[PDB]
Amino acid sequence: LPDSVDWREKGCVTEVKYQGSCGACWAFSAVGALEAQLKLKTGKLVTLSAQNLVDCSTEKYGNKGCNGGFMTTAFQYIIDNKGIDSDASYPYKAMDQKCQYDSKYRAATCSKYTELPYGREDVLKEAVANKGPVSVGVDARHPSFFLYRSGVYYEPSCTQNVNHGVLVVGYGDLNGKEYWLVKNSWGHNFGEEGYIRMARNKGNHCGIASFPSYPEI
Ligand SMILES: *[C@H](CS(=O)(=O)c1ccccc1)[C@H](CCc1ccccc1)NC(=O)[C@H](CC(C)C)NC(=O)N1CCOCC1
Numbered sequence: 001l002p003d004s005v006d007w008r009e010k011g012c013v014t015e016v017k018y019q020g021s022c023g024a025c026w027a028f029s030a031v032g033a034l035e036a037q038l039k040l041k042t043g044k045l046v047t048l049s050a051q052n053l054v055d056c057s058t059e060k061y062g063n064k065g066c067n068g069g070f071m072t073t074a075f076q077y078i079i080d081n082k083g084i085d086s087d088a089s090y091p092y093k094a095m096d097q098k099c100q101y102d103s104k105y106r107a108a109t110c111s112k113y114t115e116l117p118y119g120r121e122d123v124l125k126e127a128v129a130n131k132g133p134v135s136v137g138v139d140a141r142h143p144s145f146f147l148y149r150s151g152v153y154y155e156p157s158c159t160q161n162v163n164h165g166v167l168v169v170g171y172g173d174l175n176g177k178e179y180w181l182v183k184n185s186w187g188h189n190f191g192e193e194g195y196i197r198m199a200r201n202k203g204n205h206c207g208i209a210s211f212p213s214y215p216e217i
Pocket residue numbers: 022023024025026062063064066067068069070071136137138140141162163164165211
């Protein structure tokens with residue numbers, strides 16, 4: 001495996017989105033993972049509709065729109081629905097709306113999704129290097145995360161109880177310190193232009209490898 005990978009370098013990552021006051025973190029983490037698979041399979045990069053998931057992947061999938069959801073069951077909705085629209089045709093409103101999915105604007109499909117072994121950062125590493133960006137959950141309930149500016153994030157108060165859905169788009173080291181490159185969904189003004197580098201190999205820090213999954217077209 002390479003010492004480091006950054007999928008943004010291979011044009012597999014779209015621009016950082018801003019969720020607003022709607023807890024759709026799980027939806028953004030999900031489309032972000034599918035967006036990279038789309039590029040790898042069709043050579044094209046298009047941001048997919050997080051609003052589609054918030055409005056359509058609901059109760060049946062155990063999701064609650066602006067009140068929370070799961071990346072795994074969001075993938076399941078795309079597989080069931082036979083597709084998901086592009087962001088351009090189905091824009092983000094940061095609100096719970098009626099499902100207005102239109103197959104005419106389908107921008108991608110999903111055939112399956114894989115769930116990785118609990119707490120195994122070594123397996124997450126292989127997946128990120130060989131498959132693509134992986135959707136993960138992390139404990140982001142500490143002011144230090146909200147206030148993150150740069151560097152490798154390590155919060156001694158972090159726990160395994162995850163509550164935020166984000167996307168791991170790479171890994172590497174910063175003058176030797178190992179980290180996971182994570183795409184957040186709180187706009188460009190959060191952390192490093194929207195990303196945060198979290199501690200890697202420090203005992204499943206903040207639950208980073210607790211609930212990981214990735215889709216496949
Ligand atoms: C996204 C996380 S967030 O809102 O960006 C955030 C902000 C600040 C600090 C930490 C996280 C959502 C929030 C859902 C929510 C929770 C409580 C009140 C209102 C909204 N988180 C989720 O969707 C998580 C993601 C998983 C990876 C854990 N799931 C989730 O909250 N639920 C599962 C489905 O039932 C409802 C709760």
